[PDB]
RNA sequence: AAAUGGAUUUAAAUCUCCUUAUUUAGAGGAAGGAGAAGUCGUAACAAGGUUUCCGUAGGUGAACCUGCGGAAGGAUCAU
RNA sequence: ACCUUGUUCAGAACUUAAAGAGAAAUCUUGAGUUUAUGGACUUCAGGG
RNA sequence: UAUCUGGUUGAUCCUGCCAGUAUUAUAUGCUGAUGUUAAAGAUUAAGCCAUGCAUGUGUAAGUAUACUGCGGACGGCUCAUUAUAACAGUAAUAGUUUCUUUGGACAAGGAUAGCUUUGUGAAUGAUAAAGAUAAUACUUGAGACAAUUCAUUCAAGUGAGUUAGGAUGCCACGACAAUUGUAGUAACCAAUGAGAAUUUCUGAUCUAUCAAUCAGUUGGUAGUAUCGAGGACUACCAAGAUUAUAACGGAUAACGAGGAAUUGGGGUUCGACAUCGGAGAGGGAGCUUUACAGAUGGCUACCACUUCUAAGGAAGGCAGCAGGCGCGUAAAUUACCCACUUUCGAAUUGAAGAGGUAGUGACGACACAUAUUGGAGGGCAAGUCUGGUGCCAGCAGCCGCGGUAAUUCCAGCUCCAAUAGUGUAUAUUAAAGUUGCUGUGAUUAAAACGCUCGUAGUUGAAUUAAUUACUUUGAAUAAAAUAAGGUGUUUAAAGCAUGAAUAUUCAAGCAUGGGACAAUGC
RNA sequence: UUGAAAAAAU
RNA sequence: UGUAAGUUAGCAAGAAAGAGUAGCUCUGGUGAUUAUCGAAUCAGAACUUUAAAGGUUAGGGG
């Protein structure tokens, strides 16, 4: 499609071929807005339900102290990593606790 | 927008008004007169930035309103008043007279008239429309409507008017062998004579003009205002002559 | 946009954040002028390449190229009496 | 009132025009005034500018001509016989431009086309075939 | 020239049919994924002990087995 | 006509390469003429 | 700065992606010596509002022992709508056009104000009627054409006109204030008007799980309507218009442009918000005044709200400036003054939450006293220091470190990067030659339709001694801004205190030198 | 001829 | 004029839902023989009224 006039089978080309993506196609597809818990929101507040562990995976041992989290504009529930040593102590139930997203992007 | 406008912003102003940035919010929004809006400078900038007589804009009204300066053959008391072309311009309670003129750098000049050349001005026809009672007439420049004129003129040449009597002295015809002065865009504030003119049927008419120095520059024929026939000077051309000098006295002159 | 007052930065961090090839050469400059941080040493910088790239620019084109003799007597100039 | 834009067409094509912005006033229109026959009725509407229209409701009298021999000399006007733009203007008398009307020749003598806009200009003027 | 009757114009608001977006539906039903040491088998990687795989059809707790045709990415570049 | 041999056109393939390419196996009737990047066209793919 | 690094394995060579990295804009933890500059209720709610202010105006030149005139159709706020709609460049108005401004009977007739005269309501910028009283409020009056409508003629500058004008017959409005100081009016022509409004050409994100769409729809005739062209509307006539070169439809967390972040070239993301244009004032709808309003700090009706009350009723639209509730991760004072810039006015003075100053202000930018943040296994600078915990607590963006001798945890000592700064989470760009025209891969890593025919599309062998594209020039082309010419704000960020020719215009369009390569058929 | 399996991490 | 889900693709279907219908005076279209003659049928336009299938016959729908 080398062409001088063959300006539109390469723009069409390009248009059909960038939606298979797995990184810009999430900046495009409604679906940040409808089923992200934070949606395009840094933090997100919410209240304690239950407090749960979590075993680690196969090659690590051990019971990581975290919480199930209910927000307060969509409802939905998350399980939230209690950040510190022996900091499970310090959160409560029905308070506000401020829920902020990880390392990995999303 | 429902209507007029009023409120002219400070960046909306025409670049030629030597205007800040930092000033104010608003600049003046020169009337209705004889003259564009774009093709003018207010009143009320000529005696606070060319002439640096008043501190600020309210002490402009502490002297127009004085009746004090004259233009032309009559004495206004406007403060924004439209002061556009080579219209005569003359302050007698402070004995000096200037004249705005154009000049090569893009700018609003004021070039000093004496007093034995400050009783006339001159005006370009702008058509020659026959009215009604087979009464024609000849619309000018500034806007100016003249009684019976000479027959012979048409409606791109340029009259001598006199402001106290108001009648035409002399007449310059649009033909080879004149000269003229621009006030168009990139040529304006430059003077040549002009050397050939091509007419195009579908839009426009294009002039070439030949500058006194062997240059040559190409204009509109919207933008030619004939200041004399043969290469004769019949007012006074600004400090600069309306040359276009070649930048290279420019960069190198500043320096010292 | 919301100002109407120009502003512009001067210094811009290296990309590669440590390298001892660079943080010794730091300390030979920091100490022989006797500067109080890594501040200045990035805003030189920046007038160095304010200039070169002017320099780079206009050296692709022919000698006889007016704006080469406008801008660039003019870059020479301002940069033999400082 | 009845507005002459085009926003409530549709394109060349077919689509639908799909709105912006409200009625603006620069789009104004007025209800016809079919100027009928009988007794001297002329109103006085206020256009844009401030203007003013003779708004025509119903006429009987009419400046006529007639240029094989110049002269022109109003007549009261019978009846609407035959009208190129409608029919059932015909037989409510309206008087449009470009509409035969009948008159009776007592001034002509010791089928008339309306070409004014009565409507418009408040007045009847005509010409004889 | 004020109330008021009537006929037009532009028509707000509302009732009935007619598409796009967001939700409630209980345990409900059928999917999928994740979690060190939980059962039953040997299916695959050596000829994995019946060479493996593909399409299709049937069967069966489970991998899978068997019929027809194809492939070597087979264990043969060969009489 | 058949069998031996020369020139030449079309066809299914094969041997060698110290050369060209490739990540390598390998490919050479290209998987060569490609960071020294562009002969013309169509389709497909974007970690599992 | 045209730049990479850790991670599949016993080890190596690849594809491949995850994480690391630097920067912009949001929020937040910790810290916070100054000077200058400066963002600041948009994201979720164009949601709802107590209160206070934001549009008024008197010169000798209208009426004097409030009426009348002008303005509130500007300014200011927000970005809901909106996908050839708006907007930008450009071209036309020989198809329309105002407001303001600038050039052309020595005196008539009247009643309505101010002030009262008697009040009615709880109030509403609440309203009654009796007496006069002036006009630059209203008619007249006359001192004398102009310009429109219609039917017909003489017919020129003009790229182009049965055209500007003139002459007829004729209808209509019909003037030059009965005008004030001890300037004011009627019209008619032109400019302001490159203006306002319509309109010509070119240009917009994703989608085909949108393939056929339109019936005033396409055009013609004739009228109506509007300041003005036209299906803008009406009556008749014919069936026509778009469509694979993406018509019709759908979504946006879509107002557009100037521009902003980041770039080796090429590009990607953003733009409500400085300035221009557009739209709106809880929701449409209908109108008044006027030169311009479909005006909402104008009116009315309906839907939904709010305030006082004497229970009979009354007005209100903070998406204006402060401020209140909610919303949220997310955003300032219920301050003073017209001094700078400008606008309005009966015009040198009166008004402006426009505008300026002050206040909070670690969004950010520049110069700069002498103090914190994170880490110390690799990417990446730094400990082969000592106590505890014993795959448990825990740290770790990634690879991993911990199951009794921890280079990584909780602690004690030290120094590593930055410095008024520094970690954190999200989003934009570069790396990403992981979106690829410049610039990818297709035997085995992911990926050549089972094969052929075929319309649209793209690409098409050599040869010659009217358009369009291409190419070189110009013209015109908003400012701000991009890179700067000049200029010691003490340098710098700044600012323009001579104004760089400042170059800018991608896409389109206008005129022009050349026809090699090109598309159109005789 | 028959011949199945070997708990997770260091 | 319009007509859904389902479906054996035939049906559902007279689906559901909406508009018109009188009287009088007219006009046009549909043929045979070379202007005359003959048929009930469809369409359209004015004007009027007590606004029209309903005297009788004559589906309720989802
Ligand atoms: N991942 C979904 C599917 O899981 C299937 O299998 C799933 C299970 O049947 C399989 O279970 C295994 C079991 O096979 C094996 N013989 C014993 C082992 N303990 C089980 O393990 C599973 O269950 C235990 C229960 O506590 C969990 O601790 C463990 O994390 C989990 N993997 O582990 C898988 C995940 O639970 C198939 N692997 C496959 O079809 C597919 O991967």
Same mark, same amino acid.
């Given at each position: 499609?080398?062409?001088?006039?063959?300006?539109?089978?390469?723009?069409?080309?390009?248009?059909?071929? =960038?939606?298979?993506?797995?990184?810009?196609? !999430?900046?495009?597809? &409604?679906?940040?807005? /409808?089923?992200?818990?934070?949606? $395009? #929101?840094?933090?997100?507040?919410?209240?304690?339900?239950?407090?749960?562990?979590?075993?680690? =995976?196969?090659?690590?041992?051990?019971?990581? !102290?975290?919480?199930? &989290?209910?927000?307060? /504009?969509?409802?939905?529930?998350? $399980? #939230?990593?209690?950040?510190?040593?022996?900091?499970?102590?310090?959160?409560?139930?029905?308070?506000?606790?401020?829920?902020?997203?990880?390392?990995?992007?999303? | 927008?429902?209507?007029?406008?009023?409120?002219?912003?400070?960046?909306?102003?025409?670049?030629?008004?030597?205007?800040?940035?930092?000033?104010?919010?608003?600049?003046?929004?020169?009337?209705?007169?004889?003259?564009?809006?774009?093709?003018?400078?207010?009143?009320?900038?000529?005696?606070?930035?060319?002439?640096?007589?008043?501190?600020?804009?309210?002490?402009?009204?502490?002297?127009?309103?004085?009746?004090?300066?004259?233009?032309?053959?009559?004495?206004?008391?406007?403060?924004?008043?439209?002061?556009?072309?080579?219209?005569?311009?003359?302050?007698?309670?402070?004995?000096?007279?200037?004249?705005?003129?154009?000049?090569?750098?893009?700018?609003?000049?004021?070039?000093?008239?004496?007093?034995?050349?400050?009783?006339?001005?001159?005006?370009?026809?702008?058509?020659?429309?026959?009215?009604?009672?087979?009464?024609?007439?000849?619309?000018?420049?500034?806007?100016?409507?003249?009684?019976?004129?000479?027959?012979?003129?048409?409606?791109?040449?340029?009259?001598?008017?006199?402001?106290?009597?108001?009648?035409?002295?002399?007449?310059?015809?649009?033909?080879?062998?004149?000269?003229?002065?621009?006030?168009?865009?990139?040529?304006?504030?430059?003077?040549?004579?002009?050397?050939?003119?091509?007419?195009?049927?579908?839009?426009?008419?294009?002039?070439?003009?030949?500058?006194?120095?062997?240059?040559?520059?190409?204009?509109?024929?919207?933008?030619?205002?004939?200041?004399?026939?043969?290469?004769?000077?019949?007012?006074?051309?600004?400090?600069?002559?309306?040359?276009?000098?070649?930048?290279?006295?420019?960069?190198?002159?500043?320096?010292? | 946009?919301?100002?109407?007052?120009?502003?512009?930065?001067?210094?811009?961090?290296?990309?590669?954040?440590?390298?001892?090839?660079?943080?010794?050469?730091?300390?030979?400059?920091?100490?022989?002028?006797?500067?109080?941080?890594?501040?200045?040493?990035?805003?030189?910088?920046?007038?160095?390449?304010?200039?070169?790239?002017?320099?780079?620019?206009?050296?692709?084109?022919?000698?006889?190229?007016?704006?080469?003799?406008?801008?660039?007597?003019?870059?020479?100039?301002?940069?033999?009496?400082? | 009132?009845?507005?002459?834009?085009?926003?409530?067409?549709?394109?060349?094509?077919?689509?639908?025009?799909?709105?912006?912005?409200?009625?603006?006033?620069?789009?104004?229109?007025?209800?016809?005034?079919?100027?009928?026959?009988?007794?001297?009725?002329?109103?006085?509407?206020?256009?844009?500018?401030?203007?003013?229209?003779?708004?025509?409701?119903?006429?009987?009298?009419?400046?006529?001509?007639?240029?094989?021999?110049?002269?022109?000399?109003?007549?009261?006007?019978?009846?609407?016989?035959?009208?190129?733009?409608?029919?059932?203007?015909?037989?409510?008398?309206?008087?449009?431009?470009?509409?035969?009307?009948?008159?009776?020749?007592?001034?002509?003598?010791?089928?008339?086309?309306?070409?004014?806009?009565?409507?418009?200009?408040?007045?009847?003027?005509?010409?004889?075939?």
């Amino acid at each position: 499609a080398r062409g001088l006039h063959a300006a539109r089978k390469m723009l069409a080309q390009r248009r059909a071929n =960038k939606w298979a993506d797995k990184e810009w196609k !999430k900046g495009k597809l &409604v679906t940040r807005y /409808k089923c992200n818990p934070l949606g $395009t #929101a840094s933090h997100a507040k919410g209240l304690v339900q239950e407090k749960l562990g979590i075993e680690t =995976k196969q090659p690590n041992s051990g019971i990581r !102290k975290c919480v199930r &989290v209910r927000l307060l /504009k969509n409802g939905k529930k998350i $399980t #939230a990593f209690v950040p510190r040593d022996g900091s499970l102590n310090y959160v409560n139930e029905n308070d506000e606790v401020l829920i902020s997203g990880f390392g990995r992007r999303g | 927008a429902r209507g007029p406008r009023h409120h002219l912003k400070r960046l909306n102003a025409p670049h030629h008004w030597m205007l800040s940035k930092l000033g104010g919010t608003f600049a003046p929004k020169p009337s209705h007169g004889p003259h564009g809006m774009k093709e003018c400078l207010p009143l009320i900038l000529i005696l606070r930035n060319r002439l640096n007589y008043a501190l600020n804009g309210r002490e402009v009204t502490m002297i127009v309103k004085n009746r004090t300066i004259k233009i032309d053959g009559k004495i206004r008391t406007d403060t924004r008043y439209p002061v556009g072309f080579m219209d005569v311009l003359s302050i007698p309670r402070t004995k000096e007279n200037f004249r705005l003129m154009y000049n090569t750098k893009r700018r609003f000049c004021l070039v000093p008239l004496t007093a034995e050349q400050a009783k006339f001005k001159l005006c370009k026809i702008e058509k020659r429309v026959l009215g009604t009672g087979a009464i024609p007439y000849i619309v000018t420049h500034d806007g100016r409507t003249i009684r019976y004129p000479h027959p012979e003129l048409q409606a791109n040449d340029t009259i001598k008017l006199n402001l106290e009597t108001g009648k035409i002295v002399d007449f310059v015809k649009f033909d080879i062998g004149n000269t003229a002065m621009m006030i168009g865009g990139n040529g304006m504030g430059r003077v040549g004579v002009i050397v050939k003119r091509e007419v195009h049927p579908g839009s426009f008419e294009i002039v070439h003009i030949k500058d006194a120095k062997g240059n040559t520059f190409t204009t509109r024929l919207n933008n030619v205002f004939v200041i004399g026939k043969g290469t004769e000077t019949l007012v006074n051309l600004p400090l600069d002559k309306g040359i276009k000098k070649p930048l290279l006295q420019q960069v190198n002159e500043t320096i010292k | 946009g919301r100002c109407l007052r120009n502003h512009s930065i001067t210094y811009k961090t290296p990309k590669v954040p440590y390298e001892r090839e660079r943080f010794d050469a730091e300390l030979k400059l920091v100490g022989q002028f006797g500067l109080k941080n890594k501040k200045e040493i990035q805003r030189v910088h920046y007038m160095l390449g304010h200039m070169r790239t002017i320099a780079k620019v206009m050296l692709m084109k022919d000698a006889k190229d007016p704006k080469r003799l406008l801008e660039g007597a003019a870059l020479l100039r301002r940069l033999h009496n400082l | 009132g009845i507005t002459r834009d085009s926003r409530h067409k549709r394109r060349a094509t077919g689509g639908k025009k799909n709105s912006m912005q409200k009625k603006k006033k620069n789009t104004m229109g007025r209800q016809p005034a079919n100027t009928r026959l009988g007794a001297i009725r002329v109103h006085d509407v206020r256009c844009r500018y401030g203007i003013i229209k003779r708004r025509a409701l119903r006429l009987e009298n009419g400046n006529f001509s007639w240029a094989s021999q110049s002269i022109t000399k109003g007549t009261k006007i019978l009846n609407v016989v035959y009208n190129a733009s409608d029919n059932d203007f015909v037989r409510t008398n309206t008087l449009v431009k470009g509409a035969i009307i009948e008159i009776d020749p007592a001034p002509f003598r010791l089928l008339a086309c309306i070409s004014s806009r009565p409507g418009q200009t408040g007045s009847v003027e005509g010409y004889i075939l």
